[PDB]
A = this chain, B = another copy of it.
Amino acid sequence: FMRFRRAFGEYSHVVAFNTLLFLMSFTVLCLTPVYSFLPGVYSVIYLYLT
């Protein structure tokens, strides 16, 4: 993490959350074909959390 903070300057904070949200969304999309509940409830939770 120190090495990561060495680069990317000030924008590392913006990059980290953007990567984490993308990874979470990718996992949710991967779990979609079996659990049909996710697309709505996860979107609602995401809207609440944003």
Chain A residues engaging chain B, CB cutoff 8 angstroms: 1-2, 5, 7-9, 11
Question: Oligomeric state, in number of copies?
Answer: 2
Interface of chain A: mostly helix, strand, loop or mixed:
helix
- The listed residue (B1, B5, B11) touching A2 by CB distance below 8 A is B11
Bound complex: CA of A1 vs CA of B8, how far in Å?
A: 9
Q: Across the two chains, which residue of chain B brings its CB closest to A9?
A: B2
- In the assembled complex, the CB of A13 is this many whole angstroms from the nearest CB of chain B, namely 13
Bound complex: CA of A8 vs CA of B9, how far in Å?
A: 16
Report chain B residues within 8 Å CB of A9: 2, 5
- 6 A-B residue pairs with Cβ-Cβ distance under 8 Å, sorted by A, are A1-B11, A2-B7, A2-B8, A2-B9, A2-B11, A5-B9
